């Protein structure tokens, strides 16, 4: 499950709503730990 918001909500350009800023709980080198990771996705790669 990925938690997303708009990358640049203050935008009227054609890119408004095209890039989303999402957070993950990722695995890491050790099995006992998780990473909180922020990354950008294009709208077409995610589904609500």
């Amino acid at each position, epitope marked *: 499950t990925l938690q997303c918001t708009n990358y640049a909500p203050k935008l*009227r350009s*054609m890119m408004r709503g095209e890039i989303k800023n999402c957070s993950f709980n990722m695995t890491t080198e050790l099995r006992d730990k998780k990473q909180k990771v922020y990354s950008l996705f294009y709208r077409l790669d995610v589904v609500q």
Partner: antibody, heavy 126, light 106 residues
């Protein structure tokens, strides 16, 4: 560039004044003309704007129906007519021009900025 | 819809931190203006943080959440002014301003 406004007027309540704003140094059309009020001791109150090309307007709810905005492109001039004046309306009335369209390709966006300002027209009601 | 402090103060050379806040801000840009007695206000910062060339390096902005900030580093006596935040309502159809914050240099 320059925005040239009409001079000061002093009126009694129920009266009206006209605040002109003439463009010089840039094309009159293609930008919106905004009006901002500043009563003595107060901050900046947006009143509304007029599209110098189409004649269309956008008013703050406080002025819609009290203030008439017009224009005449043949003289590159915007106007704001203030009617039904009250003593509450003593203020300096400023005209301003925003930035042009921000084209990405075939788009507009209309982000709003002022910066091109007239010096303001003083309107006193009493 | 925009609220900012009535005043701030710095000694000359100190940083001013002038804030403005409101509900529509997370989705709308703020613009900041410097007004002195006798003149129409002049923009200092646009699109929250950008400085439009003719404005010196002492000025910059930033934003987060519902709060937008104007910071002036190295504030000098010539920077005593009423600073205003400008934005728009949530619809983007009406332009709004804060009441203005007086920055005095002591």
């Amino acid at each position: 560039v320059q925005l040239v406004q009409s001079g000061a007027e002093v009126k009694k309540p129920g009266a009206s004044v006209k605040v002109s704003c003439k463009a010089s140094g840039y094309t009159f059309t293609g930008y919106y003309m905004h009006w901002v009020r500043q009563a003595p001791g107060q901050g900046l109150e947006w009143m509304g704007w007029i599209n110098p090309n189409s004649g269309g307007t956008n008013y703050a709810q406080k002025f819609q129906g009290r203030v008439t905005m017009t224009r005449d492109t043949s003289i590159s001039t915007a106007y704001m007519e203030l009617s039904r004046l009250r003593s509450d309306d003593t203020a300096v009335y400023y005209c301003a021009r925003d930035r042009g369209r921000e084209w990405e390709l075939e788009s507009y966006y209309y982000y709003y900025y002022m910066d091109v300002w007239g010096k303001g027209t003083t309107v006193t009601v009493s | 819809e925009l609220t900012q402090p009535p005043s701030v103060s710095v000694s000359p050379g100190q940083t001013a931190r002038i804030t403005c806040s409101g509900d529509a801000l997370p989705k709308q840009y703020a613009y900041w203006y410097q007004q002195k007695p006798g003149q129409a206000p002049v923009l200092v910062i646009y699109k929250d943080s950008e400085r439009p060339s003719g404005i010196p390096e002492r000025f910059s902005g930033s934003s987060s959440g519902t709060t937008v900030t104007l910071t002036i580093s190295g504030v000098q006596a010539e920077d005593e002014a009423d600073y205003y935040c400008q934005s728009a309502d949530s619809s983007g159809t009406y332009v709004v301003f804060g009441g203005g914050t007086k920055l005095t240099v002591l």
